[PDB]
Subunit: 45 residues, 4 copies
């Protein structure tokens, strides 16, 4: 699950995923990919 | 498939999965993850 | 995709999968697991 | 996601996948498998 720092981080992320992989986009937009089903408090978006 | 020892093991497991991975939670709640589609007799819940 | 030699191979396979993994069951029931979406002519069931 | 050079590349690809794996077919039909959700401009089909 993709968890982001901000809404801007979300856009950037949803839009990167068209062309890029999960990890490339995660790193580029400043988003995290968790194991659980819930998104951390620091990456709500 | 996640198989648990007790109902308490289930709660603990369903609630751990928000934040934690499969294996961390499996170990912590005293649940097992099988290959088949059916849950062992010892881990029904 | 699970492809079997006979209907008996299918039963044995669908019933093994409750308790066992894919490969254990494949080998035990005399079924094959293909990459494609179509099942070989020799393993129709 | 499977992206192809031409419609012919698509047919060849959809029809190979019955019997063959992803990568074998990708290579044989002259199609690419991307990470993103969007297909490159050079492999639209």
């Amino acid at each position: 699950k993709s968890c982001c720092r901000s809404t801007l981080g979300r856009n950037c992320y949803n839009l990167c995923r068209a062309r890029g992989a999960q990890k490339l986009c995660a790193g580029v937009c400043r988003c995290k990919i968790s194991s659980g089903l819930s998104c951390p408090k620091g990456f709500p978006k």
